[PDB]
Structure 1
Amino acid sequence: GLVPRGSHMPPRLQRFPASADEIFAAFQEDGCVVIEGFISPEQVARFSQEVDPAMEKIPVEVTNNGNSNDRTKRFSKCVIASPTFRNEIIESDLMHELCDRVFSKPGEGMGYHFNDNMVIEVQPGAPAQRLHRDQELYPWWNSMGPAGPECVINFFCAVTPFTEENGATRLVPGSHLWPEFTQINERDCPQFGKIETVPAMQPGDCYLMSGKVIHGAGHTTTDRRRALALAIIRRELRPMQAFSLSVPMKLAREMSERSQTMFGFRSHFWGNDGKDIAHHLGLIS
């Protein structure tokens, strides 16, 4: 009795809070999974107010030009601005546990690192964001289709509530197993206009979405719908943010060894002439 009997059933979106191989199997089969309470409630609020002065100093473009900055606020300096983010959020042992299952190969250590730490605030009345796969950032990845390896995963967590009215992200579970990965355009996508989405949540909930999954933010009067994006890429890919050049050394000295690897203060990709870059940085005892 999930939908009234005889109905069209809409694409499945499982939900967990919880065993790791369990949530991974839901990730594999559907491409998207809600993780209710990825961050503790006081933590999400401790973080949200912590960055609210940064967010307050971001002007809103009323552009009507169709891009992803049209009435949507975006801010990446979450490690400087928020001690909660860098000391608590970035240290979820289940996040690494899932990252290690999507990305790492055994005996090769950590196969992943951060792409971005973005806070995305859909300002009230914003056009819907164009449908896209996150792996379009790495433009050849679609050409490998669903047999290709994973490019990117986003732990996309709600900061303020995600409702079907304020602009919550619309997911297309199963778009990671389609046979051809295209740009989602009428010219390029044979299924344009017929793509069935599901809107994605309360503060503290994440959703782990594969980079192969089609999605977008949707279109109220006062609701600043705010989210925290933990985009994570394999170690061979380059990050959107030059974190080891903007995050001060002081904060990097406070990070765990694994979090230093996430931001590229530690490494052989991204090495230093056969040595770990962390030697030259004064980070190895």
Structure 2
Amino acid sequence: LVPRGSHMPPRLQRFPATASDEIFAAFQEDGCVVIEGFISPEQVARFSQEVDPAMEKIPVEVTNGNSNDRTKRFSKCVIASPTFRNEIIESDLMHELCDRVFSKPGEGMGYHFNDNMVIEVQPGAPAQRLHRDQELYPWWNSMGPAGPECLINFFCAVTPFTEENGATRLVPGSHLWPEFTQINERDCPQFGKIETVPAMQPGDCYLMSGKVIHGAGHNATTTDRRRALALSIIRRELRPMQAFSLSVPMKLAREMSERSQTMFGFRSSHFWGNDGKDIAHHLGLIS
């Protein structure tokens, strides 16, 4: 795999979207894993064109070290794209995976959606700061690698992921380090020695844990809009960064299955209920 004698780089396993528990142990051991072909070939295609009109009406910032410097972001994927709401979010591998990360026996679905983002790294965009996704829930790093999982991300490539256009540089095994710190020169002892691994073709995805260090690289090209679809998924006890049950129209919620209504907060798991009853009753969604 490496020339004999070489420094071996951090292991980044890769499974086919038809694999089994097998993908999960790669997640447990490394903190991430690639699912090659996560979304079908025409599915990803129909999806990208469907959000191209919305992506077109996002002006680009040319700035300050923020994650908005020449990186454009858009989250109304259920509204804008029939392919997303009808096909992509009903992956049984997605759910069979989430149930192994999040759900406890007897309690139903321990998870729901945090965000559905399309991230498009514009050419010349500086490399994104290194971070753990779970910094979104600021106390979580304090629990170290023994803490439970709060967040996972099915990070899917829309346009191809190269080392040129700044695909995500992962750091496998970052979830097993003994202290979880901010990744900067004052707080991180290993800053500048952190060994990355860049991450894929359209429809491939990687299933990253919230504990894993990562970040978008510099998009060094002149023409490449590098586009992605992040399926952020949190445990049921945590609050979504998107208010999906207030912006997704009721017309679309009626077309979703019970699992997908639970993912978007149109149905309870009790958490997110309505005075001892499922919020789905009051909304006109049960029997």
Q: TM-score range by the shorter chain?
A: over 0.9
Does residue 44 (structure 1) correspond to residue 44 (structure 2)? The answer is yes
TM-score by length of 1: 0.99
Deviation string, structure 1 residues 6-25 (Cα, Å, up to 9, x no partner): 00000000000167600000
Structure 1: stretches of 5+ with no match in the other structure: none
Q: CA deviation at 1:4?
A: 0.3
Task: Name the SS of the counterpart of 1:3 in structure 2.
Answer: coil
Q: CA deviation at 1:273?
A: 0.1
In the aligned structure 1, how far is the partner of 2:117 from the partner of 2:189? 32
Change (3 A) 1:55 1:18: closer
In the aligned structure 2, how far is the partner of 1:18 from the partner of 1:36? 6
In the aligned structure 2, how far is the partner of 1:180 from the partner of 1:24? 24
In the aligned structure 2, how far is the partner of 1:17 from the partner of 1:260? 28
Task: Name the SS of the counterpart of 2:175 in structure 1.
Answer: coil
In the aligned structure 2, how far is the partner of 1:258 from the partner of 1:43? 21
In the aligned structure 2, how far is the partner of 1:34 from the partner of 1:246? 31
Deviation string, structure 1 residues 164-221 (Cα, Å, up to 9, x no partner): 0001000000000000000000000000000000000000001000000000000100
In the aligned structure 2, how far is the partner of 1:32 from the partner of 1:22? 13
Would the aligned equivalents of 2:17 and 2:36 in 1 still touch at CA under 8 Å?
Answer: no
How large is the Cα RMSD of the aligned pairs?
0.7
Would the aligned equivalents of 2:17 and 2:35 in 1 still touch at CA under 8 Å?
Answer: no
In the aligned structure 2, how far is the partner of 1:42 from the partner of 1:109? 32
Task: Name the SS of the counterpart of 1:16 in structure 2.
Answer: strand
Task: Name the SS of the counterpart of 1:176 in structure 2.
Answer: helix
Q: CA deviation at 1:141?
A: 0.1
Deviation string, structure 1 residues 246-281 (Cα, Å, up to 9, x no partner): 000000000000000000000400000000000000
Does residue 101 (structure 1) correspond to residue 100 (structure 2)? The answer is yes
What residue is the counterpart of 1:269 in the other structure?
A: 271
In the aligned structure 2, how far is the partner of 1:191 from the partner of 1:232? 29
In the aligned structure 1, how far is the partner of 2:18 from the partner of 2:100? 13
In the aligned structure 1, how far is the partner of 2:72 from the partner of 2:17? 32
In the aligned structure 2, how far is the partner of 1:97 from the partner of 1:124? 36
Change (3 A) 1:95 1:31: same
Task: Name the SS of the counterpart of 2:271 in structure 1.
Answer: coil
Task: Name the SS of the counterpart of 2:33 in structure 1.
Answer: strand
Q: CA deviation at 1:57?
A: 0.1
In the aligned structure 2, how far is the partner of 1:43 from the partner of 1:35? 15
What residue is the counterpart of 2:281 in the other structure?
A: 279
In the aligned structure 2, how far is the partner of 1:26 from the partner of 1:224? 30
Structure 2: stretches of 5+ with no match in the other structure: none
Q: CA deviation at 1:283?
A: 0.1
Q: CA deviation at 1:159?
A: 0.3
In the aligned structure 2, how far is the partner of 1:83 from the partner of 1:129? 30
Would the aligned equivalents of 2:163 and 2:198 in 1 still touch at CA under 8 Å?
Answer: yes
In the aligned structure 2, how far is the partner of 1:229 from the partner of 1:159? 10
Would the aligned equivalents of 2:152 and 2:209 in 1 still touch at CA under 8 Å?
Answer: yes
In the aligned structure 1, how far is the partner of 2:150 from the partner of 2:104? 14
Deviation string, structure 1 residues 73-92 (Cα, Å, up to 9, x no partner): 00000000000000000000
Would the aligned equivalents of 2:17 and 2:37 in 1 still touch at CA under 8 Å?
Answer: no
Following TM superposition, the consecutive aligned residue runs of length 4 or more in structure 1 with deviations greater than 6 angstroms are none
Pairs aligned (count) = 283
In the aligned structure 2, how far is the partner of 1:17 from the partner of 1:56? 32
Deviation string, structure 1 residues 66-119 (Cα, Å, up to 9, x no partner): 000000000000000000000000000000000000000001000000000000
In the aligned structure 1, how far is the partner of 2:283 from the partner of 2:17? 37
Task: Name the SS of the counterpart of 1:209 in structure 2.
Answer: strand
